Design a protein around this ligand. Structure first.
Ligand SMILES: [Mg+2]
Length: 491
């Protein structure tokens, strides 16, 4: 039943002794009813969970390679019905080491939906090849307000780190942690999707089909005046949303495949345009969308999977961009998309990415989108996920305490008023705002009261010119009232 392309097939995992190593559940050999959605091509499959932990025989077994004997702390990532978790007991074994612990009940209503569970007892691993097994030994089941889809115990990944390496890791995470006071004081910012799939206002090919032209015609002063009108204190600008087109020079991208960069350094002109008004610029970057047409498969070609080429492209890219603009750019990683669903599954070197992001700007906030997952890496700065058009969740305080799901991160909200990508048909915007201006005022007012920065998206036409509104005027009108209620004079 279970299908895995050789790049995703179970295999022996080299443990990095000074580091957190993460191993996806599908990389273990599976017995019994344990199953996962098919993974037939080299392309990552988001829904990687392992399901089927119904009996004491549904066992999964990893083969790890510990360079020497040592005690590793174990973390499990899983989700499922709280009625199942309330009566589920884990068993982690290797050789004669045997950890037994009850599951944690999710006692918060917000994200993260998947939880990270640090087991109390450590795990001895011999030198060389080890076999690590995971299974349930006691079982809950779902109880009786009436839906259809079940919510079984679903296993995502196992994590292993020597407790000495963990303390040292957290020490360096603390030493480079970003100061987000400029974001708290700014109160809110603008998310702008320069999406490769958006159709121009005036008609024509989508952005990803005439990218260089639209970058040459982009009017920075038209854009900066609308940003300044709505009160935004920063802009998170979409690079490579849907394709790997990048709105400026890049020796790293050019070195993989030509055609994706621009002669016009639009990033530079956005920095200088916005900076006349003390408005900062952070980048969105998508490391998967259209990557097959730039780098190819994340794990390469040839018989066996090798991510190192992919990882180096990312590190060099983050580094070059960070150095090219320096402190002038607030961050080249304000929003790195699908850090959780996609990047996490390759077991990436998070620290190298982060050191690359901060190389030119040591206060650059790093925001890997963790989707519905807990903190991706101790080196995160911001909570990052896609809020669609909903009221922002207030994540309870205890998630951010030591041990917590989100320890080390600072709350932040990312969502849209009308839509993510503009959908303009016949010179009229087709995505209206979701809420009344009064509700948005309440949203922004509460986020200000709790010092949670907000980055709201207003859908934008990709042809930024003088000819037409680039933002939905209803959306703009709402945001002008928001600016009055939150950033204007109060008495
Ligand atoms: Mg505040």
């Amino acid at each position: 039943k279970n299908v895995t392309h050789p790049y995703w097939a179970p295999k022996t995992w080299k443990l990095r002794a000074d580091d957190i190593t993460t191993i996806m559940g599908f990389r273990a050999k599976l017995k019994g009813n344990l199953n996962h959605l098919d993974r037939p091509t080299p392309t990552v499959v988001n829904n990687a969970f392992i399901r089927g932990f119904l009996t004491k025989e549904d066992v999964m077994t990893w083969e790890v390679e510990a360079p020497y004997e040592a005690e590793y702390n174990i973390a499990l990532l899983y989700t499922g019905s709280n009625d199942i978790l309330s009566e589920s007991t884990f068993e982690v074994t290797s050789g004669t080491s045997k950890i037994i612990e009850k599951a944690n009940v999710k006692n918060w209503d917000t994200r993260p939906i998947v939880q990270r569970h640090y087991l109390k007892q450590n795990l001895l691993l011999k030198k060389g090849i080890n076999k690590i097994s995971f299974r349930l030994v006691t079982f809950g089941k779902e109880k009786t307000n009436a839906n259809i889809k079940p919510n079984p115990f679903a296993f995502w990944s196992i994590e292993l780190v020597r407790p000495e390496a963990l303390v040292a890791i957290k020490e360096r995470a603390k030493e480079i942690k970003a100061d987000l006071q400029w974001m708290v004081d700014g109160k809110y910012g603008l998310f702008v999707h320069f999406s490769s799939s958006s159709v121009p206002f005036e008609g024509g090919l989508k952005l990803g089909d005439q990218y260089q032209k639209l970058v040459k015609d982009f009017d920075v002063d038209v854009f900066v005046e609308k940003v300044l009108e709505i009160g935004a204190s920063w802009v998170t600008f979409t690079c490579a949303h849907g394709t790997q087109h990048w709105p400026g020079p890049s020796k790293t991208i050019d070195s993989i495949k030509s055609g994706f960069t621009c002669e016009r350094d639009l990033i530079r002109e956005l920095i200088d345009g916005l900076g006349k008004h003390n408005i900062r610029l952070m980048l969105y970057y998508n490391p998967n969308s259209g990557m097959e047409d730039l780098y190819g498969n994340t794990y390469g070609n040839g018989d066996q999977p090798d991510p190192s080429g992919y990882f180096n492209f990312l590190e060099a890219h983050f580094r070059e961009v960070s150095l090219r603009y320096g402190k002038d750019l607030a961050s080249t990683a304000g929003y790195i998309d699908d850090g959780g669903w996609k990047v996490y599954q390759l077991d990436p070197p998070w620290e190298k990415f982060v050191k690359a992001i901060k190389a030119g700007n040591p206060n650059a906030p790093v925001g890997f989108s963790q989707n519905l997952f807990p903190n991706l890496t101790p080196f995160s700065d911001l909570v990052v996920s896609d809020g669609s058009g909903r009221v922002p969740e207030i994540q309870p305080a205890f998630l951010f305490e030591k041990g917590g799901q989100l320890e080390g991160q600072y709350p932040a909200s990312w969502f849209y008023m009308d839509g993510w990508s503009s959908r303009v048909k016949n010179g009229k915007f087709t995505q209206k705002p979701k809420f009344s201006a009064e509700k948005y005022i309440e949203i922004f007012k509460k986020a200000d009261q709790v010092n949670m920065p907000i980055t709201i998206n207003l859908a934008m036409t990709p042809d930024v010119t003088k000819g037409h509104p680039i933002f939905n005027p209803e959306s703009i009108e709402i945001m002008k009232k928001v600016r009055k209620a939150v950033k204007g004079y109060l008495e």
